[PDB]
Design a protein that fits this description.
189 residues, globular, Thrombin, subunit H, seven-stranded antiparallel sheet, six-stranded mixed sheet, monomer, 3C-like proteinase nsp5, 2 helices, 43% strand
Length: 189
């Protein structure tokens, strides 16, 4: 069974940088999203993330909660996630924590597109650190979570699809599960 998704739906936003749009997670006054949002299509082949981060300013990021634009007032990189500091705290922020899960453990995924929740399903982390998800274009930044009474444990942010059709991603501190890298290059499970 998947967990009810209401607590997470209220945290989902759309993040756009240039022509690249994906999803972000808005907790308190920070938006978390995959750092490859800052890449053009070309950049994704061999990204120098340090240098791409330099050339972006706060106003190059468009963050929208539904129809409301949120002002980005700071940005930083933590491993493979970007943290955007916004001028508005999310009033729907649940009690939450960030946890890193192990193979064999299950969690719920809230698949989102353009910041809009689309569906909920249960996944299990496989021994090679991949998951058999259902993700299309624009699904990056969708999150995985468990619920402990009233507390949402976020454990997964979505980044990529592998050639065999399984999926890989990070925890919410930006560290990949498994030996994967956020580069459009020869990678296999
Ligand atoms: C995020 N919105 C998408 C989610 C993908 C699209 C198809 N299904 C998914 O889960 N992520 C990406 O587009 C990432 C992103 C560049 C390319 N990429 C990939 O997932 C590609 N895969 C790989 O390069 C591979 F095989 F190495 F894993 C793609 C061929 C587009 C499926 C970056 C930065 C990795």
């Amino acid at each position: 069974m998947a967990f009810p998704s209401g607590k997470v739906e209220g945290c989902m936003v759309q993040v756009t940088c240039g022509t690249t749009t994906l999803n972000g997670l808005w907790l308190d006054d920070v938006v978390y999203c995959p750092r490859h949002v800052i890449c053009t299509s070309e950049d994704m082949l061999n990204p120098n993330y340090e240098d791409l981060l330099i050339r972006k300013s706060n106003h190059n990021f468009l963050v929208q909660a539904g129809n409301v634009q949120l002002r980005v007032i700071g940005h930083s990189m933590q491993n493979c996630v970007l943290k955007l500091k916004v001028d508005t705290a999310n009033p729907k922020t649940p009690k939450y924590k960030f946890v890193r899960i192990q193979p064999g453990q299950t969690f719920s995924v809230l698949a989102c597109y353009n910041g809009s929740p689309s569906g909920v399903y249960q996944c299990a982390m496989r021994p090679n650190f991949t998951i058999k998800g259902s993700f299309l274009n624009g699904s990056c930044g969708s999150v995985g979570f468990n619920i402990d009474y009233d507390c949402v444990s976020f454990c997964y942010m979505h980044h990529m699809e592998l050639p065999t059709g399984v999926h890989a991603g990070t925890d919410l501190e930006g560290n990949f599960y498994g030996p994967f890298v956020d580069r459009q290059t020869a990678q296999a499970a």
